[PDB]
Curated annotation (Swiss-Prot), chain B:
Keyword vocabulary terms for this entry: Cytoplasm, Glycosyltransferase, Magnesium, Transferase
Subcellular location per the Swiss-Prot or TrEMBL entry: Cytoplasm
Cofactor(s) needed by this chain: Mg(2+)
CDD domains (UniProt xref): Glyco_tranf_GTA_type
Source species: Pyrococcus horikoshii (strain ATCC 700860 / DSM 12428 / JCM 9974 / NBRC 100139 / OT-3)
Family to which this protein belongs: Belongs to the glycosyltransferase 2 family.
Predominant place of localization: cytoplasm
A GO molecular function held by the record: mannosyl-3-phosphoglycerate synthase activity
This protein's name: Mannosyl-3-phosphoglycerate synthase
Listed transmembrane segments: none
Length: 357, 369
């Protein structure tokens, strides 16, 4: 692959946000050259997590068929389990798919009681609802996929949505993730793909412009659902849910590493730095309350130890023209004895499906 | 890559039409056919990807170019405007910028290049020029030029792609699906046609063109308007080509009437010996490209190709005249235009033809090719 070289960028404390780069050429033997083979090497160390809930089976099928064989696939379904039992429909698709491709894949249902059991017996209750079960939501699904990914030794994790109309785009996202990591110089790296979102980008940059003093545009992937991170970085990040996930990752990262403090708490991170790559894909986005998305994204910014007295004012008046709801946040999953957690997920979960993984 | 294995198929004389196959898995090294990623990249280097274009949007052309595997040489035959404003000029700029950023091996020429029309005359091949003696405007002619250029650089396979695709990634899959079709082939004379309601009518009559002789209805043919297709140079080289919307269906009609049965086998003894294989691959990506007058100009011409086939029967004939009228595109008493057909470019001396293009064409552009 060929991409524009990473030239321009801005720094905030220990955070480096690279200017968006374009993919210049897809298949390859001011321009970065990431050989196709270095990408396939990294691919084998990247878990592609797919949190899903009632998506169209023909779309899920295409996304699955597009993920590079090399990549382990982790599916966390919070699909409807009755009248009709759709998890059941997905289980069937997954095995047919495995029978035709031998892809390495793990699938589990979010409501698996053997899953909720591992979280408690391990002390991690941040992901449970009042009925003692894992709360429905996208962040929780991502958290489960994340731990599963850690349990199999993944070094990188990429997120992909199962309702893409363009399988080829999914194939490019994964490769673009790899490309982002291969151009990184830090073990704490995030890759966010790019092709409302501007209002989120407008305020995220503003979140910063208000103490650098200079208006910026550098941030352009604030609602980037298609993103990837190294396991090291994912594991120390508190996660939100719903539409707050993407913008919140950015807000938290600046909040905690935008200045230098408690450097002792996260030594290696402050020293190695956090890099955020923003790659503009070659393919367009096509998939299938803009008001909630919009309110939750901005709520993420309005509520930080870093939003100014004035920044909040505009958001407010922008939203109105009664404050924004504080976003649900779950603690990092780093201090979870992954093995113990996995042992009891394996010995108690009734929906876990393993195929050569 | 993984594909459903070729199991079902039908034969007609020396023609083997394989049942449509689906791509089951995209990236692979490892009822199912396994064509390792690497065998595909080897073939890729011997395949010229021909892109006949005419006034397409620059940003779409740019994406298509960026998606073609670096290893594939690219041949562009532009018949774009030359003033008000000169957009061949805009394309030349895009192509150089592209070349400076990627070092892709590429050749581009304008269809109206007088140094191009000169090579065709001095070589005896007049089928492609009009009165003025210039190369006629049209997609088949563009394809013919790209085809000879491809032959001039030693391409063994040629794949056709349209420059107005909205999905770069799909173009990237087409080229790979072409290779896959060729790698599952057992004949040097192979065609690969991609697949994903005008084509259902063309497919209906194409199969009917055959069912009328076998007496058994078939649905084997499902890529009658497959713009995305590819062939071995050996096969492309001996085929008469039409133009406009008749190109794709006509390739099928001609292959069926010349090899649909043994005869004058001496004229093409090697072809009859190895047979012609037609693979039909269903892509993983959908089809989303850049009118409606066109769609039923497409209907009118696809069907005319069949109607004028020496394989047609009076029955298939009135059924076509009829379907065609019931739609309001053919008068109640006029029979469909006959198609335009130039002949195989096999007897053109490629070497002395290329010398004339190289030494006389003011629009020819080359980058490591």
């Amino acid at each position: 692959m060929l991409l524009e070289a990473p030239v321009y960028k801005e720094i905030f404390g220990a955070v480096t946000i690279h200017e968006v780069q374009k993919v210049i050429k897809m298949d390859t033997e001011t321009i970065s050259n990431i050989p196709r083979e270095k990408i396939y090497d990294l691919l084998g160390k990247m878990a592609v997590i797919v949190p899903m809930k009632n998506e169209k089976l023909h779309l899920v099928d295409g996304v699955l068929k597009a993920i590079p064989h090399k990549c382990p696939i982790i599916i966390v379904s919070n699909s409807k389990r009755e009248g009709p039992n759709r998890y059941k429909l997905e289980v069937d698709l997954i095995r047919h798919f495995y029978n035709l491709t031998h892809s390495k894949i793990i699938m589990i249902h979010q409501k698996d009681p053997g899953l909720a059991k591992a979280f408690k017996e391990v002390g991690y209750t941040d992901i449970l609802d009042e009925n003692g079960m894992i709360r429905s939501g996208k962040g929780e699904g991502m958290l489960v996929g994340l731990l599963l990914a850690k349990a199999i030794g993944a070094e990188y994790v990429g997120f992909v949505d199962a309702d893409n109309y363009i399988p080829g785009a999914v194939n490019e996202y994964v490769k673009d993730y790899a490309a982002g990591f291969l151009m990184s110089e830090s073990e704490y790296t995030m890759v966010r793909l790019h092709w409302v979102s501007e209002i989120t980008n407008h305020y995220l940059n503003l979140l910063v412009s208000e103490h650098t003093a200079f208006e910026t545009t550098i941030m352009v992937t604030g609602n980037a659902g298609e993103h990837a991170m190294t396991m090291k970085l994912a594991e120390i990040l508190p996660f939100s849910t719903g539409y707050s996930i993407e913008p919140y990752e950015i807000v938290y990262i600046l909040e905690r590493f935008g200045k230098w403090e408690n450097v002792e708490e996260f030594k290696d991170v402050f020293d190695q730095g956090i890099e955020i790559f923003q790659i503009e894909t070659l393919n367009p986005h096509f998939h299938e309350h803009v008001k909630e998305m919009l309110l939750l994204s901005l709520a993420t910014i309005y509520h930080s130890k870093l939003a100014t007295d004035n920044l909040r004012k505009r958001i407010l008046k922008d939203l109105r023209d009664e404050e924004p709801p504080k976003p649900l946040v779950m603690r990092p999953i780093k201090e979870i004895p992954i093995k113990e957690w996995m042992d009891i997920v394996e010995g108690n979960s009734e929906t876990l499906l393993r195929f050569e993984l």
